[PDB]
Amino acid sequence: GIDHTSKQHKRSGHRTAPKSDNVYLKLLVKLYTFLARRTDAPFNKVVLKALFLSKINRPPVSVSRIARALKQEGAANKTVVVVGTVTDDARIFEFPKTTVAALRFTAGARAKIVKAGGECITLDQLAVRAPKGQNTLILRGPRNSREAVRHFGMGPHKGKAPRILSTGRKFERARGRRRSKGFKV
Amino acid sequence: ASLPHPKIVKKHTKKFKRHHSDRYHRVAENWRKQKGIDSVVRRRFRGNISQPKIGYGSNKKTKFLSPSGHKTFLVANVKDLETLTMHTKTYAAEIAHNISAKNRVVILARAKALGIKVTNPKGRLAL
Amino acid sequence: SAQKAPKWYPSEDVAALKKTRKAARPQKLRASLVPGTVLILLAGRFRGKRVVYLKHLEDNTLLISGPFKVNGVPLRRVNARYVIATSTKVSVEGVNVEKFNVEYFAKEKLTKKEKKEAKEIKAERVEDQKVVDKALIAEIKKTPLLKQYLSASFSLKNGDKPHMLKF
Amino acid sequence: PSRFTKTRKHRGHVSAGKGRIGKHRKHPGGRGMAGGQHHHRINMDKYHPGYFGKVGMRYFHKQQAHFWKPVLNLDKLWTLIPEDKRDQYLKSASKETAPVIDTLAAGYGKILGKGRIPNVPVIVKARFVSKLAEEKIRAAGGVVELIA
RNA sequence: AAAUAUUGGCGAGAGACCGAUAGCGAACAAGUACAGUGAUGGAAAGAUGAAAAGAACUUUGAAAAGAGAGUGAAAAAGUACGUGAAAUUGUUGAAAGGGAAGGGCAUUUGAUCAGACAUGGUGUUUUGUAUUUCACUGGCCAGCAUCAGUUUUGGUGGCA
RNA sequence: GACGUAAGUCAAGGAUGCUGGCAUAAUGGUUAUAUGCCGCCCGUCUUGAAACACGGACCAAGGAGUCUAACGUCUAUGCGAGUGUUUGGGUGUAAAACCCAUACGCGUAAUGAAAGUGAACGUAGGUUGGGGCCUCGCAAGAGGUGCACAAUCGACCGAU
RNA sequence: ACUAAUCGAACCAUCUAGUAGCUGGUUCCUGCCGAAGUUUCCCUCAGGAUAGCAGAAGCUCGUAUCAGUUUUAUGAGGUA
RNA sequence: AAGCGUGUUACCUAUACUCUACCGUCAGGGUUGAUAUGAUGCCCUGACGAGUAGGCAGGCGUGGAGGUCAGUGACGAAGCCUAGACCGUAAGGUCGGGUCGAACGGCCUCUAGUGCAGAUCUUGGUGGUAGUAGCAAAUAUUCAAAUGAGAACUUUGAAG
């Protein structure tokens, strides 16, 4: 007998392999797991870990975010790495020249980078030039900006978005919402 | 004379029958849970049937092995045996029920000449 | 193809035996089993037969020769666990046991072809048995009643206690 | 499909996933949001505040046509111009002949003021504008013209 | 007029449909037999065999029918007819059996069942040159010796 | 590691050596019975079932968390500030497949009840922590940099 | 009382698969984890809603802001 | 005392603990410049394993769709029986024997009216209860001949 102090036979709770089925991605995973295991730089050990993430967990990193990382001093020549795809943007107008490696790039994204003189490559070519990740930088997409992130944390005095298919006046704007009617939250 | 293997043990030879399958002809012989609440067999009152559990698993280096020392593998024609010919040491060819006798004779002749062990050589023989 | 195939094909090469760290350590006999002591056979053709121990072999077995003229038991080899030693010890220095060895006790060549499906002592065996008993009979005769002791069988009485018996 | 529906896995278990004690009935708590004021009060309040009751005057025959009002933030302003001429227009800021953007033809109602447009002359023809969207484009030298 | 519905009727074509306790209630003489005064209700019942070639004829029996025979690829297809399961029953055989029997652990007994390796094989002259005509192995089960691990049980030594 | 001057040996990171008998019911399997001990009749309700609680004579077949409109979370996929061809049109080997314009939905701005109004002083702010990266550092470590994200204070739009 | 063996509201069909917090049943395997009968509110007491209790999906990180614990010091309590 | 009270030891046994083997789960890992079936694989280490409701995963099976196995098949498919065997922990699969006569499998994927012991379940069928209860109101029949194979019930006669 054992006084099991916790969840015995507990699973890690961390993704072991990407539960998706794209063979190319699994091929790419086989690349980094050899790299992460046989290297020492903690860089690749985190790039691979973020590779298992879901569609929501790999949000589209805007090239505008990329430009901001370029504006981050001490990183002018640093190559940019983004797990997940990268989209183009209309807010910005002049993207400084650099090289960016990421999963995917939209039609405008590839166009904007190339017409910026940039150099987009895959994670494979990323390994080729930077085995241990020489002067790289990892950029993660915004994760607290989805729909349902505003929908969690419900409760009175919580002030979070209410899940409602229909939206507008006379919907969730009655007693209990304003102290005028009944109470307020 | 195959690759020698660790000494064989099934670790529970007796087959698992459903509770009270003996006394009722409409209880299917194949094993099942019997997930009632009153069930004596659902929790293993000593002196009653022990439901299958992992610990009754065989050894990994014996899984799917014949007591003769082969992993059986059935066949239906000469061409299917060709994928086996190199591996006479580990796999044993086997003839299916739905193979004609005149088909069996050419199969057996081919297999025996190749020395591939066969596990139903005496089926549907003509005498 | 009513059963397609196993993809992962197991190997066929036999991995060699591990270099086990075991050695042929020589046998160390007991205190009561001394060359020249009187033994009693326990199991086999000659159960309960009084005999005399001659020489331990490199076959970790006991060359035993009760006087074949006396007990009708000729020279042969027995296993250590199957004999009880008796404090009665005789002299064996006067008899030589040099040429009794494993190849001399080679029973016969058995194979899978020249086999007697249905169902002749070597002459030289008799004389070497004779030459051994020459000194042995002259030796055993030095003390009274021992000839009869080696002649007679051995059997337990009623209620006699081996745990209390002193051989 | 159906073979992955866990009722298939559940098959054999007496309650089929709805409990031995509860013994899933037809409609225990009523139908719909029944009893929102009697025995569902807390859910209809602590998850859905402001459910029961009304507010605001009742608009009769409210036609969506009048309240059509797409929003065009100044960052999105340059999207209307074609990509091939977009770069051509970012460079060579031509006050003498500056591009026009027909947000109305683009079906964009009112110009808003998210800001940060390059200091180039741009003519904007939109139904509505803000206070500072005018200011920001005025700072960039652009003028705005009004079309219904 | 058109574009639009159509489970009625007819016609036409299809089905990732059902396959005779399903599918129309109805695959068959079904809205039938059958019940109810009536309003109504409402069945069960598809398949021998390629071909009836549907068992002539002989015989016992009053006859049915049986035994023969004969047709038939099959009569273990005979109109009580594709295959023919079980519950149930009979017969034979096998067993056991003192108010249950039935099951689990393991074993005896009895019945009954696959497997070894009997290898091209330490080769050893083809009767006008491919039988190595002696085996090399491990199949099973044991015993002994030496060990390693776990541990048990003493007996003796020195010491504080 | 020990023994060893070494050579190597070894009780040293998991059993070898030798011998015998048999090669089949011999071992083993299954089974039937007997034996020792044990075993309540199962499903369900209940705190409590073996119950003097209820269903269950038996057996074969049928037989029960499906479908869909709207969605939620999560995941997978494509695209991605867009997105969605299949309302329709063209086309066709023809209910297929392929192609195509239009708007149109949802997001790309919210906010008020409404009139309306509608998000940059700042490097899109600061602070704290923050993976990773970079500089130095044999290496700790030091710094610089800090994505996402956590909390806070700001700023801006709307409402009062 | 009787109104076709049906009567304190006949019978036939449709609505209609009327209804149900109530009873009964809910069909394969094996793994891994693993409960509650409690807060409050309800014409609420055989039921619901919530909080809790469970699993699963995981995510950010890597030895910590921790601990059904003791000790030091320091309180506070009105039971024996 | 085989009682009481007390104490000394020795001993017996739990799925208790310790050691080992094996299985599975989990955790940590290691495993590609010509070394491996080219990795959700293999390998190493260690810790664990109860459990209804409930949850999740990996699995077998049924009806069908697509592709594939130039799969099986009248010298015998499916089904069925089989104290015959084999494989799996099981879902089950495979083979052998017998009947049988015409379609059916394995793999990958897809789909579903998809897995039975229950529901005073349905339909159909057969039981023990069983050659038993019962076949007893109405006074009541008998002899003979005849038909007929067969007569208590048929005919007739003679009675009552």
From the list A45, A100, A104, the residue with the least C-alpha distance to A69 is: A100
Q: Which of A137, A129, A24, A3 lies closest to A80 in space, CA to CA?
A: A137
- For C34-153, list the strands marked E by DSSP: 37-41, 50-56, 62-64, 76-78, 83-89
Alpha helices (H) along chain A: 23-38, 42-49, 63-71, 107-115, 123-129
CA-based end-to-end distance of chain D: 53
Q: Are D146 and D127 in contact (CB under 8 A)?
A: yes
Distance CA D102, CA D123 (A): 9
Tokens of B32: 């099942």
Kindly list the domain boundaries of chain A, sorted by start residue: 14-145
Round to whole Å and give the CA distance between C58 and C101: 8
Q: In this structure, what DSSP letter does residue B54 have? A: G
Asked if B24 CB < 7 A from strand H, the reply is yes
| Residue C166: partners with Cβ closer than 8 Å, 6 or more residues away | C87
Query: Is residue B116 a part of any domain in this protein?
Result: yes
- The answer to whether position B51 is within a domain reads yes
Cα D137 to Cα D148: distance, rounded to the nearest angstrom: 20
Secondary structure class of C70 (helix, strand, coil): helix
Q: Which value, to the nearest 10 degrees, does the dihedral of the CA atoms of residues D19, D24, D30, D33 take?
A: 50
Euclidean distance between CA atoms D113 and D137, whole angstroms: 9
Residue A146 CA, nucleotide H48 C1', distance (Å): 40
Say if residue D113 is exposed, middle or buried (CB neighbours under 10 Å; 0-12, 13-18, 19+): middle
* Bases along strand F below 7 A from a protein CB: 9-18, 20-21, 23, 29-31, 37-47, 49-51, 53, 58-60, 65-67, 70-82, 104, 108-109, 112-115, 117-120, 123-124, 131-135, 144-150
* Minimum Cα–Cα distance from C7: chain B residue: B83
* Cβ contact D83:D114 at 8 Å: no
Q: Are B88 and B117 in contact (CB under 8 A)?
A: yes
Sign of CA dihedral A129, A130, A136, A139: positive
CB atoms within 10 A of CB A25: 16
| Residue given tokens 């507990």 in the structure block | A10
Rounded Cα distance between C71 and C154, Å, is 12
- Going from the C-alpha of B37 to that of each of A184, C73, C120, C159, the distances in angstroms are 50, 74, 77, 60
D51, D58, D83, D112: best mutation site toward chain A, by most A Cβ within 10 Å?
A: D51
Pairs of residues, one from chain A and one from chain D, whose beta carbons lie less than 8 Å apart: 54
- Name every residue whose Cβ is closer than 8 Å to that of residue B71 and which is 6 or more positions away in sequence: B64, B65, B90, B91, B92, C6, C10
Q: Tell which CATH classification among 3.40.710.10, 3.100.10.10, 1.10.443.10, 3.40.1500.10 matches the domain A14-145.
A: 3.100.10.10
Query: Of the candidates A93, A169, A185, which has its C-beta nearest D49's C-beta?
Result: A185
In this structure, are residues A162 and A185 in contact, taking their beta carbons and an 8 Å threshold?
no
- Measured distance CA(B10)–CA(B59) in Å, rounded: 8
Method: cryo-EM
Counting CB pairs under 8 A, whether chains D and C reach 3 or more, is no
Per CB-CB distance under 8 Å, the chain B contacts of D20 are 37
Breaks (C-N over 2.5 A) in chain A follow: none
A174 → closest Cβ in D47, D50, D90? D50
Task: For residue C32, give Cα distances in angstroms to A118, C29, C50, C56, D43.
Answer: 97, 9, 16, 13, 95
Flag if B33 and D12 touch (Cβ within 8 Å). Answer: yes
CB < 7 Å to strand F — which of 85-144 in chain A?
A: 85, 87-91, 104, 106-109, 132-144
CA distance A10 to C163: 59
Strand H contact at CB of residue B98, distance < 7 A: yes
Provide the CA C91 distance to its chain's centre, in angstroms.
Answer: 20
Element housing A119 (H / E): strand A119-121
D121 in Cβ contact with D92 (< 8 Å): no
D7 CA – F153 C1', rounded, Å: 53
Half-sphere exposure of A45 (CA within 13 A, CB side): 6
Angle value at C-alpha D6, between D2 and D8, nearest 5 degrees: 65
Could you tell me the resolution of this structure in angstroms? 3.9
Q: Do D14 and B35 touch (CB under 8 A)?
A: yes
Nearest to B81 by CA among B91, B66, B69, B70: B91
* Residue B74, domain member (yes or no): yes
Which residues of B spanning 32-91 put their CB closer than 7 angstroms to strand H? 32, 34-37, 42-44, 46, 52-67, 72, 74, 76-77, 79-80
Q: Please state the domain count of chain B.
A: 1
Distance from C-alpha of A91 to C-alpha of A112, rounded to nearest angstrom: 13
Chains meeting D at 3+ CB pairs closer than 8 A? A, B
CA atoms within a 13 Å half-sphere pointing along the CA-CB vector of A153: 9
Alpha-carbon torsion D27, D33, D36, D42, what sign? positive
SS3 of residue B4 by DSSP = coil
Q: DSSP state, C104?
A: G
Which has the closest alpha carbon to B89: C10, C1, C4? C10
Which SS3 state, helix, strand or coil, does residue B61 take?
Answer: helix
Q: Is C117 helix (H, G, I), strand (E, B) or coil?
A: coil
Domain that holds residue B74: 6-127
Residue B66 distance to chain D (closest CA, Å): 32
The whole-angstrom separation of Cα B81 and Cα C1 is 10
**The pair of three-digit structure tokens given for residue D125, joined into one six-digit string:** 């023809």
Within a domain: residue B89? yes
**B71 is a domain residue:** yes
Q: Which residues of C touch B1 (CB under 8 A)?
A: none
Q: How many residues does chain D have?
A: 148
Q: Which bases of strand G sit closer than 7 A to a protein CB?
A: 19-34, 36-37, 40-44, 47-50, 55-62
Q: Is D142 left (phi over 0), alpha (psi -120 to 50) or beta?
A: beta
Residue C107 is classified by DSSP as: -
Counting every residue, how long is chain A? 185
* Contact residues for C164 (Cβ-Cβ < 8 A; gap 6+): none
* Cβ(A143)–Cβ(A150) below 8 Å: no
**Main-chain phi, psi angles of C54, to 5 degrees:** -105, -60
Residue A59: both structure tokens together: 């949000």
CB-based contact D53 A181, cutoff 8 Å: yes
- With vertex at residue B72, the alpha carbon angle to CA B66 and CA B78, rounded to the nearest 5 degrees, is 150
Q: How far apart are the first and last CA of chain A?
A: 51
Q: What is the 3-state secondary structure (H, E, C) of B62-123?
A: HCCCCCCCCEEEEECCHHHHHCCHHHCCCEEEEECCCCCHHHHHHHHHHHHHHCCCECCCCC
- Measure, in angstroms, how far nucleotide H62 C1' is from residue B60 CA: 31
